[model samples]
Target: EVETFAFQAEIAQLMSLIINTFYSNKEIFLRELISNSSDALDKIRYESLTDPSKLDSGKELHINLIPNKQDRTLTIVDTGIGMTKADLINNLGTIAKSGTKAFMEALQAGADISMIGQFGVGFYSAYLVAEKVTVITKHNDDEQYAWESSAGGSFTVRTDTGEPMGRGTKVILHLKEDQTEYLEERRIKEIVKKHSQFIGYPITLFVEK
Candidate 1:
């Protein structure tokens, strides 16, 4: 059977607060994404220390920001520990436990990172700007899989039939109307240097002026 599920009812409320209540600040999605990418890379690096061979027989360690003006889509690709089918289902499909309380509590404690820290809730933040978000990932534990969601309620995860990613993830954001500035080089760089200057990953935005 296919593995897919709906987010907890309370997630709808938390998502509204982030996607609409702070609509203008949706630019933060980029920061959250890049931060998560850095964390993923960190995970593999830490693992490699134990097994030296845990080193990439896969993708290299780096980030690529590809803004396709033609398709009006921005893709963030990372060479890190990718997620397996079960990983995607568990991490992206459902929260399992109650996250609504902990997420808000973290905000109150000013440990906002705790909310979207592990690319968990932060993944939903992409919906703040993009009408749809598509994720393609491959893990050393498994071949590869793709997940797509509008963040309206549910998400679909399926086997990737195209080229294999070899061990990493590619997150593509289909920008909403009037939110096209996200695909601009100058704007992307500014947001990166501003909100994510401290990001451990290095990704250079490419676009002509």
Candidate 2:
């Protein structure tokens, strides 16, 4: 089943603000995404410590960055604690109903990176560099699904029919013309070194060469 949700009035405004303002350094997009993947990985690891079944997928905990020049897309895949349909609707569809509203208020009060971590707005950073974003995720308890948005008024979620996935998430960024620099291996390496050098999980970048 496919579903579409419009962003709340306030949420649409905040998203526009995120895309046009807030982050002056565009490279922060990659950092935010990688940080999110790290958080997901950490969650799965922590849960697995309590219930080993959390790791029943047998997928190694890691992140992968695949840049396809032909498609002009950058895909960030993570083997972590995937979300359910309810989680997707609650977490992504209703950002304004959650900590993101607090994050926006904190912005008015001059927020910082720490606040970003505490809040849920980091995922919106994808819009800073991408014209469109597609997220395919699989949860151990639910079938695979896809969520898509174009930094517009609405987003849609539907059952995914692409390749089957383990319990995790795959985020594909359809890059904007000006943001194509992120498609280069050199640029990705530099950004990872600068921002995520201390991340605990292994991060692999695909290079056909």
Candidate 3:
């Protein structure tokens, strides 16, 4: 059944900090997304190596980005390990069950670059630019599901019956009016090249002729 879940109380407060104050630079959203995408790609690549059938049916392994200026939308799609219904709920519904206290404690214990990277708060950084977010994902073992939220303290997850999506995750960001800097092709390339150039997988940006 399609479902809605609320963020746990403490996390709701922490999300406030992430959405309102944590990210000083809104463009960091792309950086976080590419990082996550690379990680996902790494997961599937490692999986498929052990079992060849695990790879999708002739699917190319790459990340594709599309920007729609008219729609004010920016999308990043990756051929990576997608989420099942439960994973989406667990990952997106409330910050990965570790909650804010434990995450902060981890951060406090080790404020190093990797320590801070372990937390999933980076996903919430999308709200710094987009007023709303939609994630459409398909996993090998499960049907495709779409999760959506406006950073409104609650999110909804629903099964997708519209079209076929290969195994992977696609994140669509509805850009806030002033955040159009994210919509420019040049800016996106610069950010990906600067922040995500080292990712093991190839990242591509789509530009219309």
lDDT of 3 at 159: 90
For all predicted structures, in order, the TM-scores are: 0.84, 0.90, 0.87
Q: Model 1 shows how many backbone clashes?
A: 0
Candidates 2 and 3: which is better by TM-score?
A: 2
lDDT for each residue of candidate 1 in 1-209, tens digit (9 for 90 to 100): 34567856676566666666533567778877887788788887778778777665653688888898788799998888878788787755336345556677776776553246442567767877788888999877787888887777777888888777777889999989888999888888888888877766678676643
**What lDDT tens digits, residue by residue, belong to model 3 across residues 1-209?**
66888966665665566566544556677888877888788878888988888785435778888998989999999888888888887765235546466666765675522232357656766777888999999888989899988766888899988577879889999999988988898999888887777888777788865
Who is ahead in TM-score, 1 or 3? 3
User: What are the candidates' C-alpha RMSDs?
Assistant: 3.2, 2.3, 2.9
Instruction: State how far residue 67 of model 3 sits from its true place (Å).
Output: 0.9
Worst 10 residues of 2 by lDDT: 90-99
At residue 190, give the lDDT of candidate 3: 85
The lDDT leader among the candidates is 2
The lDDT ranking, best first, is: 2, 3, 1
